[PDB]
């Protein structure tokens, strides 16, 4: 993970750790979370701290972020995979086809993964823009 | 009926591939049995595949790689056409005896007789093999027979 | 679809309830019966041989001899298509099968190598162009029995074996020979045709309406009886298409021209020429539209119940046009026909004192000389007082009443016969296209066997030809068949089916015979009817069991009889009156000289001497032999026509009459040799190429026999079902037909295998892509899962709220 990236993770961690005790707790999350709108409740708060083997210091923080953010492909590799199902290289796939591929083939998406995947995918006139969707996936926008 | 080493594994490879395309789960739909063997190099008639257990439509029955091996070895021993057999069949449809058959007849024979191929398949086998009919609209079936027997990747 | 098989196939669905009956070969059987020929019975009491049955027909009882009983076939064989497959081949079974089919509407049935055709006496929808389309190139066992399969099978053998074929259609008068001859020619003309006046095919077909107009005439047995025989050859070129056609005629009954018996008519052409169907012609022929007006054609009936003389005359006129006839030739014929009509109206009287014979007006002789192209005065002179020459002289002499009515009659008879033969040559001229000919298919249609209340030379001649054709059939079906087996090295013990008519044939044909005695007595200036009767009785009475003194009259009103002849188809009482005269036809060179130089082109042709006749029997006997031999050079295909009853009624069966016909025909015998011998035979050359596919196994050229042996051997064929000849391989009945089925099963399999190869190629082509798309989809599903887990991660849903203000 790039350096400029680590620099942002720090400042972020600095802002999340309220009591400035070097470690992130259920009290800090709640506190800074409330100043921005909504306290994930103690119910969910535990689970957040349950995602780290032991104490939650900047080392762990930056670790759990790489796990859950590394092991993906370049916007060009996904772009290429979608192209393998678009022989007429029209840059789009029929909505019914791509939904079929995702739901009943390979590693079948459950009904839930389908709703979330499509609740915001680019679709007009039965056409599924895989290019604009590829961009979206690479969370840059 | 004694599968060699390559064969036993090419089947495992081809099995997973078809397993993946209907939902990776160690199973393959029985309606794809024939298709799996065609990938292995065997040209089983639909009558054989139904015999060894193959189903008529997707969703009726799935098959673990275990129940598969028997079917493959069943279709493995069936009869495969030979050039001479094919050329004698075609000769009964050719009057002039020059080795020519109407393009309409070819489509007739392939989609009306035997275990009828769909019009979609006949069109596709004709585009792939690059079958060219001449002005009078005839085709040299010997040439067509050889192409089909040569496989998608000749040389 | 099925619709065309209306009167051809057996429902077997509704006839499935007809094969599902309570039967028992120990109980049910056939028993002789005066009425129906055989009655279905059910055995009951037992007494050594005195077996007591119960006739189901009328629920009555009867006691028959254990030797008169006949085995009944199970319901399974109802309306069986090929009688040679029945379990019990007996006169009753054959009778029941045909009768059953007949009543169902099925008029065609196979019986071993030949076909049986029962006259329907009504039009059936089985001869359309659609039915023809379904029978082309079909195997007999593959499609319902139909006259068409016989024609087709004939065509198939001709191209396959490269040998001429001949369809012999036999039968008693009115059994349906002519009708069947027509369809056979029509069928060949519509499947073998090549790529004002019509094409050749059309012409072959139009050749019928005219010859029949001049050669047919109502008869007690047939309203459209063929009074002449015809052998027609259809030629074929290299490519197997029609390339010409000729016709040959045999013995045209000339007595009918100037005479008719009660309830009988003169040739059709006469009544339609006076039908005023084409008014604009009445003034060309000079006739009044009234048939009952001329004595040469008004002696019997004038109209026929199912013959419309009008439309028929129109169709005749049209035929002549499609035939390529000029308006001249056409009107030339029409005129000479009317000439004869008028000839009968010419009146004469016996001079005042010199009781001789003289003219009596000339209105008629004038019309005659006019149409014929001569001088009416030069005509009556040659009829009332001729100049008999000697080497180069003349002897003027007048004649009396009968001498004159005979010379005129003779002139009519001569002009007509002479014109019929001209009509034939002209027709051949047209059908003779100089295309390349390799083989031909001949169709023979003679005048059937017949018994009138009065039988004369006409009938002797006809029944003779039939005798000789039935013999050509048994010699071919029972004698040659067996000579063939023996000649091929096949161990075969000869069987005698008792089908030989030489006795009756030699009595007529050979030097001892009738026609020889008749031919001898035409050389004696003073031979008489009585003199003839003596020489006959002298060499045959009590001397030959076929020649017999006339028995006791067995029919209402039958004329004089001088001797009976035991023909194969029955015993015939003949009257030899006027035979010496009918056999040799007097040629009045006084009149042939006149007509010879006639302004009329046709008549001028019809009468040409030559440059610088025998008896009729001699001519007929020779011609019949010339033809009978040509037929041995071909491969015969027989159709046996059968007349159902004597009322020309549809669906009515006279059991005794049919049986009688099945008997003299030799149907039963024919079916026996078919199941006792090896009807199928194939030259090894042909067997190889047709069935190697039944065992491709081999094939590393190799002689034909060896290959033929490996296939049969490898097919596990019961050695009893066939025999390896020294040239051909013989098969039992039924065998070769299953091989044809296997060969088809095989072809359908090879085709299905070629189809599986295709299915296997389409897949193997989409393989690479399928595995490359597995990579693509695993990548797509994996990166979409990361994206989801992330966007839904509590932590990420915080790094994004803080990320902004850093
Ligand atoms: N196949 C048939 N279809 C319709 N009518 C027929 C058929 N065969 C015979 N007939 C009828 O019976 C009569 C005898 O026919 P035909 O062929 O002329 O006898 P021959 O055997 O005397 O030629 C015909 O004029 C016709 O009305
Ligand atoms: O009556 V038929 O003479 O044509 O046999
Ligand atoms: Ca699966
Ligand atoms: Mg803290
Ligand atoms: Mg006839």
Cα dihedral C718, C719, C721, C723 in deg (nearest 10):
160
Given a contact cutoff of 8 angstroms between Cβ atoms, the answer to whether C217 and C264 are in contact is yes
Domain spans, chain A: 1-70, 71-138
Element (H, E) at C158: helix C147-161
Pocket test for ligand 1, best of C174, C182, C643 (most atoms within 8 A of CB): C174
Resolution for the entry shown, Å: 2.5
Domain end position, chosen among B80, B107, B136: B80
Pocket test for ligand 1, best of C105, C106, C119 (most atoms within 8 A of CB): C119
CA nearest to C456, candidates C245, C298, C188, C256? C256
Given a contact cutoff of 8 angstroms between Cβ atoms, the answer to whether C213 and C272 are in contact is yes
User: What single string gives the DSSP state of each residue in C745-778?
Assistant: HHHHHHHHHHHHHHHHHHHHHSHHHHHHHHHHHH
**What is the DSSP code (8-state) at residue B21?**
T
User: What are the phi and psi torsion angles at C98 (to 5°)?
Assistant: -65, -45
Given a contact cutoff of 8 angstroms between Cβ atoms, the answer to whether C49 and C63 are in contact is no
Total number of domains in chain B: 2
Residue B85 and residue B54 share a domain: no
List chain C gaps (C–N > 2.5 A) by preceding residue: 195, 612, 700
CB spacing of A82 vs C776 below 8 angstroms: yes
Rounded to a whole number, what is the largest CA-CA distance in chain B?
56
Domain C327-441 grouped into CATH 3.40.50.720: no
Residue B59 and residue B96 share a domain: no
Given a contact cutoff of 8 angstroms between Cβ atoms, the answer to whether C173 and C219 are in contact is yes
Angle ∠(C639,C248,C570) on CA atoms, nearest 5: 45
User: What are the phi and psi torsion angles at C199 (to 5°)?
Assistant: -70, 180
**What is the DSSP code (8-state) at residue C449?**
B
> Half-sphere exposure of residue C559, counting CA atoms within 13 Å on the CB side?
12
Give burial (CB, 10 Å; 0-12/13-18/19+) of C457.
Answer: buried
Residue numbers in B near C752 (CB within 8 A): 45, 47, 114-115
Give me the residue label for tokens 């058959």. Answer: B101
Residue B65 and residue B23 share a domain: yes
Question: Any idea which ligand is nearest the CA of A106?
Answer: 3
Residue B73 and residue B130 share a domain: no
Total Cβ atoms within 10 A of residue C779:
18
Atom of ligand 2 nearest to the CA of C445: 4
Total Cβ atoms within 10 A of residue A34:
11
Q: Is C215 in the pocket of ligand 1 (CB under 6 A)?
A: no
Q: Is C177 in the pocket of ligand 1 (CB under 6 A)?
A: yes
Total Cβ atoms within 10 A of residue C65:
11
Where on the phi/psi map is residue C681: left (φ > 0), alpha (ψ -120 to 50), or beta? Answer: beta
Q: The domain A1-70 is classified under which CATH number: 1.10.1200.10, 1.10.1740.10, 3.40.50.2300, 1.10.238.10?
A: 1.10.238.10
Residue B140 and residue B86 share a domain: yes
**Residue B83: closest C-alpha in chain C:** C754
Structure tokens at C412: 């009519």
SS3 category, B29: strand
User: What single string gives the DSSP state of each residue in C181-250?
Assistant: HHHHHHHHHHHS-------HHHHHHHHHHHHHHHHEE--SS-TTEE-SEEEEEEEE-TTS-EEEEEEEEE
Q: The domain A71-138 is classified under which CATH number: 3.40.190.150, 1.10.238.10, 1.10.1060.10, 2.40.50.110?
A: 1.10.238.10
User: What are the phi and psi torsion angles at C534 (to 5°)?
Assistant: -75, -50
Distance of CA C336 to the CA centre of its chain: 31
Question: Any idea which ligand is nearest the CA of A14?
Answer: 4
Residues C130 and C134: their CA atoms lie apart, in Å, by 7
**What is the DSSP code (8-state) at residue C475?**
I
Residue B76 and residue B7 share a domain: yes
User: What single string gives the DSSP state of each residue in B54-115?
Assistant: --SSTTS-EEEHHHHHHHHHHHHTS----HHHHHHHHHTT-SS-SSEEEHHHHHHHHHHSSS
Cα-Cα end-to-end distance for chain A: 20
Smallest CA–CA distance, residue A81 to chain C, in Å, is 4
Distance of CA C421 to the CA centre of its chain: 22
Structure tokens at A25: 């707790």
Question: For residue C685, what are the contacts with CB-CB under 8 A and spacing of at least 6?
Answer: C704
Structure tokens at C777: 């989809």
Residues A104 and A98: their CA atoms lie apart, in Å, by 10
Residues C765 and C757: their CA atoms lie apart, in Å, by 12
B114 CB near a chain C CB, below 8 Å?
A: yes
Given a contact cutoff of 8 angstroms between Cβ atoms, the answer to whether A135 and A95 are in contact is no
Element (H, E) at B150: helix B141-150
Element (H, E) at C71: strand C70-71
User: What single string gives the DSSP state of each residue in C395-427?
Assistant: -B----HHHHHHHHHHHHHHHHHHHHHHHHHHH
User: What single string gives the DSSP state of each residue in chain A?
Assistant: --HHHHHHHHHHHHHH-TT-SSB--HHHHHHHHHTTT----HHHHHHHHTTSSS--BHHHHHHHHHHTT-S---HHHHHHHHHTT-TT--SEEEHHHHHHHHHHSSS---HHHHHHHHTTS-EETTEEEHHHHHHHHTT--
Residues C143 and C150: their CA atoms lie apart, in Å, by 11
Structure tokens at C772: 């490359």
Containing structural domain, residue B49: 3-80
Rounded to a whole number, what is the largest CA-CA distance in chain A?
59
Give residues 6 to 45 of B whose Cβ lies within 8 Å of A: 20-24
User: What are the phi and psi torsion angles at B103 (to 5°)?
Assistant: -80, -25
Question: For residue A105, what are the contacts with CB-CB under 8 A and spacing of at least 6?
Answer: B20, B21, B22, B23, C777
Residue B74 and residue B25 share a domain: yes
> Solved by what technique?
X-ray
CB spacing of C788 vs A116 below 8 angstroms: yes
Structure tokens at A66: 């790489």
Domain end position, chosen among B47, B80, B113: B80
Residues C32 and C40: their CA atoms lie apart, in Å, by 9
**Residue B114: closest C-alpha in chain C:** C752
β pairing state of B100-102 and B62-64? unpaired
β pairing state of C728-731 and C680-683? antiparallel
Q: The domain C680-737 is classified under which CATH number: 3.40.50.1580, 3.40.50.740, 3.30.70.1590, 3.20.20.80?
A: 3.30.70.1590
Distance C654 CA to ligand 2 centre (A): 19
Question: For residue B50, what are the contacts with CB-CB under 8 A and spacing of at least 6?
Answer: B56
Q: The domain C457-630 is classified under which CATH number: 1.20.58.530, 2.60.120.40, 3.40.640.10, 1.10.8.100?
A: 1.20.58.530
Residue B98 and residue B55 share a domain: no
Give burial (CB, 10 Å; 0-12/13-18/19+) of B99.
Answer: middle
Question: For residue B10, what are the contacts with CB-CB under 8 A and spacing of at least 6?
Answer: B40
Specify the CATH number for the domain of residue B24: 1.10.238.10
Total Cβ atoms within 10 A of residue C266:
27
Name the packing angle between helices C457-474 and C502-509 (round to 10°). Answer: 140
CA nearest to C1, candidates C111, C131, C107, C92? C131
Residues C479 and C477: their CA atoms lie apart, in Å, by 6
Of C692, C750, C774, the CB nearest to B81: C750
């Amino acid at each position: 993970l790039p350096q400029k990236q680590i620099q942002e993770m720090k400042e972020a961690f600095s802002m999340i750790d309220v009591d400035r005790d070097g470690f992130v707790s259920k009290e800090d999350i709640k506190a800074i979370s409330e100043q921005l709108g909504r306290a994930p409740d103690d119910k969910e708060l535990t689970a957040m701290l349950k995602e780290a083997p032991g104490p939650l210091n900047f080392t762990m923080f930056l670790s759990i972020f790489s796990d859950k953010l590394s092991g993906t492909d370049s916007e060009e590799t996904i772009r290429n995979a979608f192209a393998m199902f678009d022989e007429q290289e029209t840059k789009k796939l029929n909505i019914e086809y791509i939904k079929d591929l995702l739901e009943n083939m390979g590693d079948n998406f459950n009904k839930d993964e389908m709703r979330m995947t499509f609740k915001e995918a680019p679709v007009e006139g039965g056409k599924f823009d895989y290019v604009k969707f590829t961009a979206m996936i690479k969370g840059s926008g | 009926p004694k599968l060699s080493q390559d064969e036993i594994d090419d089947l495992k490879d081809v099995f997973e591939l078809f397993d993946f395309w209907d939902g990776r789960d160690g199973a393959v739909d029985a309606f794809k049995l024939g298709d799996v063997c065609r990938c292995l190099g065997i040209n089983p008639r639909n009558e054989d595949v139904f015999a060894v257990g193959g189903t008529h439509k997707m969703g009726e029955k799935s098959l673990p790689f275990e129940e598969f091996l028997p079917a493959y070895e069943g279709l493995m021993d069936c009869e495969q056409g030979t050039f001479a057999d094919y050329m004698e069949a075609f000769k009964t449809f050719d009057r002039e005896g020059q080795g020519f058959i109407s393009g309409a007849e070819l489509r007739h024979v392939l989609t009306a007789l035997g275990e009828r191929l769909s019009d979609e398949d006949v069109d596709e086998i004709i585009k792939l093999t690059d079958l060219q009919e001449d002005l009078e609209g005839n085709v040299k079936y010997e040439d067509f027979v050889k192409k089909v027997m040569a496989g998608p990747y000749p040389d | 679809s099925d619709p065309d098989f209306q009167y051809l196939a057996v429902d077997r669905k509704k006839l499935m309830k007809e094969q599902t009956a309570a039967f028992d070969g120990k109980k049910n059987c056939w028993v002789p019966d005066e009425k129906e020929g055989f009655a279905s019975a059910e055995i009951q009491s037992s007494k050594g041989d005195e077996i007591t049955v119960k006739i189901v027909a009328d629920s009555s009882t009867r006691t028959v001899k254990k030797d008169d009983i006949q085995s009944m076939n199970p319901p399974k064989f109802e309306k069986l298509e090929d009688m040679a497959n029945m379990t019990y081949l007996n006169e009753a079974s054959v009778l029941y099968n045909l009768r059953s089919r007949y009543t169902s509407g099925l008029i065609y049935t196979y019986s071993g190598l030949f076909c049986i055709a029962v006259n329907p006496y009504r039009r059936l929808p089985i001869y359309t162009d659609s039915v023809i389309a379904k029978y082309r190139g079909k195997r007999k066992t593959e499609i319902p029995p139909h006259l068409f399969s016989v024609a087709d099978n004939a065509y198939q053998n001709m191209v396959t074996d490269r040998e001429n074929q001949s369809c012999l259609i036999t039968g008693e008068s009115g059994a349906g020979k002519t009708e069947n001859t027509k369809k056979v020619i029509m069928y060949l003309a519509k499947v073998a045709c090549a790529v004002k006046e019509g094409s050749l095919e059309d012409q072959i077909i139009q050749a019928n309406p005219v010859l029949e107009a001049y050669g047919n005439a109502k008869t007690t047995r047939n309203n459209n009886s063929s009074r002449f025989g015809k052998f027609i050859r259809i030629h074929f070129g290299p490519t197997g298409k029609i390339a010409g056609a000729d016709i040959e005629t045999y013995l045209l009954e000339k007595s009918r021209v100037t005479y008719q018996q009660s309830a009988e008519r003169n040739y059709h052409i006469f009544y339609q020429i006076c039908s005023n169907a084409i008014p604009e012609l009445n003034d060309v022929m000079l006739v009044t539209p009234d048939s009952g007006l001329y004595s040469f054609i008004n002696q019997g009936c004038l109209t026929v119940d199912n013959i419309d003389d009008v439309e028929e005359f129109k169709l005749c006129d049209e035929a002549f046009d499609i035939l390529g006839f000029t308006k001249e030739e056409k009107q030339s014929m029409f005129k000479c026909t009317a000439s004869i009509l008028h000839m009968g109206e010419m009146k004469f009287k016996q001079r005042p004192r010199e009781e001789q014979a003289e003219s009596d007006g000339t209105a008629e002789a004038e019309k005659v000389a006019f149409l014929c192209g001569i001088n009416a005065g030069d005509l009556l002179k040659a009829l009332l007082k001729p100049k008999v020459k000697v080497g180069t002289e003349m002897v003027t002499k007048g004649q009396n009443m009968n001498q004159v009515v005979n010379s005129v009659g003779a002139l009519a008879k001569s002009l007509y016969d002479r014109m019929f033969n001209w009509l034939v040559r002209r027709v051949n001229k047209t059908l003779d296209t100089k295309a390349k000919r390799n083989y031909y298919i001949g169709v023979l249609d003679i005048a059937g066997f017949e018994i009138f209340d009065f039988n004369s030379f006409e009938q002797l001649c006809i029944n003779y030809t039939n005798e000789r054709l039935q013999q050509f059939f048994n010699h071919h079906m029972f004698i040659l068949e067996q000579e063939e087996y023996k000649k091929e090295g096949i161990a075969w013990e000869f069987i005698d089916f008792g089908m030989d008519l030489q006795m009756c044939i030699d009595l007529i044909e050979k030097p001892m015979g009738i026609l020889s005695i008749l031919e001898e007595e035409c050389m004696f200036p003073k031979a008489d009817d009585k003199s003839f009767q003596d020489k006959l009785y002298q060499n045959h009475m009590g001397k030959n069991r076929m020649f017999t003194k006339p028995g006791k009259p067995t029919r209402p009103n039958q004329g004089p009889a001088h001797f009976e002849l035991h023909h194969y188809a029955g015993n015939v009482p003949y009257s030899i009156t006027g035979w010496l005269e009918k056999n040799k036809d007097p040629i009045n060179e006084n009149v042939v000289a006149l007509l010879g130089a006639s302004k009329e082109p046709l008549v001028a042709e019809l009468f040409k001497a030559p440059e610088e006749f025998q008896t009729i029997s001699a001519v007929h006997r020779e011609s019949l032999n010339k033809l009978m031999k040509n037929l041995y050079s071909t491969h015969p295909h027989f159709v046996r026509c059968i007349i159902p009853n004597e009322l020309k009624q549809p669906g009515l069966v006279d059991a005794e009459l049919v049986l009688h016909q099945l008997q003299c025909n030799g149907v039963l015998e024919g079916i026996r040799i078919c199941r006792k011998g090896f009807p199928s035979r194939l030259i090894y050359s042909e067997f190889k190429q047709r069935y190697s596919i039944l065992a491709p196994n081999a094939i590393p050229f190799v002689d034909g026999k060896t290959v033929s042996e490996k296939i049969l051997a490898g097919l596990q064929m019961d050695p009893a079902e066939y025999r390896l000849g020294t040239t051909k391989v013989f098969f039992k009945a039924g065998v070769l037909g299953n091989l044809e089925e296997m060969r088809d099963e095989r072809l359908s399999k090879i085709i299905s295998m070629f189809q599986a190869h295709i299915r296997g190629y389409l897949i193997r082509k989409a393989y690479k892509k399928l595995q490359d798309q597995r990579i693509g989809l695993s990548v797509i599903q994996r990166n979409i899962r990361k994206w989801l887990v992330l966007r839904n991660w509590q932590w990420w849903k915080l790094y994004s709220k803080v990320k902004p203000l850093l």
